[PDB]
Amino acid sequence: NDNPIPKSVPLHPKSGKYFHNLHARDLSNIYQQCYKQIDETINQLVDSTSPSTIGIEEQVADITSTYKLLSTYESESNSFDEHIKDLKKNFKQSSDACPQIDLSTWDKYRTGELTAPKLSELYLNMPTPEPATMVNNTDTLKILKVLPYIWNDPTCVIPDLQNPADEDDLQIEGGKIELTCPITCKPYEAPLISRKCNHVFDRDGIQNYLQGYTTRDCPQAACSQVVSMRDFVRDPIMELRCKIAKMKESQEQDKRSSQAIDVL
Amino acid sequence: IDDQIQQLLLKQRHLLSKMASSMKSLKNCQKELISTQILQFEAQNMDVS
Numbered sequence: 001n002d003n004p005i006p007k008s009v010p011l012h013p014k015s016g017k018y019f020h021n022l023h024a025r026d027l028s029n030i031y032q033q034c035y036k037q038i039d040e041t042i043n044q045l046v047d048s049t050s051p052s053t054i055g056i057e058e059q060v061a062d063i064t065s066t067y068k069l070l071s072t073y074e075s076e077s078n079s080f081d082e083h084i085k086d087l088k089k090n091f092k093q094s095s096d097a098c099p100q101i102d103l104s105t106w107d108k109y110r111t112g113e114l115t116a117p118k119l120s121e122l123y124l125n126m127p128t129p130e131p132a133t134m135v136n137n138t139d140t141l142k143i144l145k146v147l148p149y150i151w152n153d154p155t156c157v158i159p160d161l162q163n164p165a166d167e168d169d170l171q172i173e174g175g176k177i178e179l180t181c182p183i184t185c186k187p188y189e190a191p192l193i194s195r196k197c198n199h200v201f202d203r204d205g206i207q208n209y210l211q212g213y214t215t216r217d218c219p220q221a222a223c224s225q226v227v228s229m230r231d232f233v234r235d236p237i238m239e240l241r242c243k244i245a246k247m248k249e250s251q252e253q254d255k256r257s258s259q260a261i262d263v264l
Numbered sequence: 265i266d267d268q269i270q271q272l273l274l275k276q277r278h279l280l281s282k283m284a285s286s287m288k289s290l291k292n293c294q295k296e297l298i299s300t301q302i303l304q305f306e307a308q309n310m311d312v313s
Contacts, residue, residue: 015305015309022305024298041280053266070287
């Protein structure tokens with residue numbers, strides 16, 4: 001009507017060139033660089049704070065909030081790109097469905113009696129991104145959450161699935177997790193744990209037990225299962241505990257020696 | 265040394281917050297790039313037709 005400017009027209013092959021050219025610009029490299037940066041910052045912070053200094057809980061909470069915000073950003077960016085591709089597919093299908101303007105179909109579209117899909121309206125009507133079907137649980141997040149307790153004491157039992165207060169009401173009765181293996185009187189240089197056994201092993205003597213037998217029972221108690229080589233994975237918690245224990249024992253030995261010399 | 269370490273930790277957490285702020289600002293830039301571009305693409309299709 002009036003000025004012959006139709007609201008929308010069917011897609012053209014020349015316009016199809018640009019439609020295929022249009023894409024959402026990526027953040028995969030940016031996101032992975034950010035993730036690696038925050039992970040290495042957490043790793044540095046693990047031993048960065050002075051052993052006598054206490055109160056890393058607020059910094060841990062702040063870093064947890066930062067990581068959660070980053071993960072939410074990544075999830076909604078994935079939502080962005082999937083929405084973009086779905087919108088492109090819907091628009092191309094609608095354009096293919098609609099006819100082509102040759103003689104007066106353009107006039108009909110201009111008069112408004114005929115309508116064609118418009119990417120602007122579709123992008124205005126696309127649903128807002130939703131952080132659904134996404135879980136903010138990573139190994140870095142887990143170690144970040146559990147590191148304050150390890151800092152407080154090397155032996156801790158954080159899970160509260162059985163009871164929110166502790167493992168059993170107020171008393172854990174969980175014993176201690178020893179850095180030095182009775183089998184191998186040495187710190188765990190290769191901490192390997194099973195998703196089923198949930199026990200950390202040095203693997204130096206475990207390979208000797210697992211050679212010649214396809215599956216062998218877990219030597220530790222409180223469980224009964226057989227595992228192979230490929231069920232073992234690296235557990236950062238174990239060497240985190242080892243490092244904090246060594247650092248604390250070094251600082252306490254230095255303090256006691258210095259005070260004893262000050263006595264003389 | 266401990267005071268300097270604490271100051272560096274505070275500085276690095278401040279930079280972490282700053283780069284978190286730059287995050288989703290980069291996403292808003294990405295959205296304002298992809299948006300207002302499809303409208304001009306529609307104008308290009310208008311010209312082509």
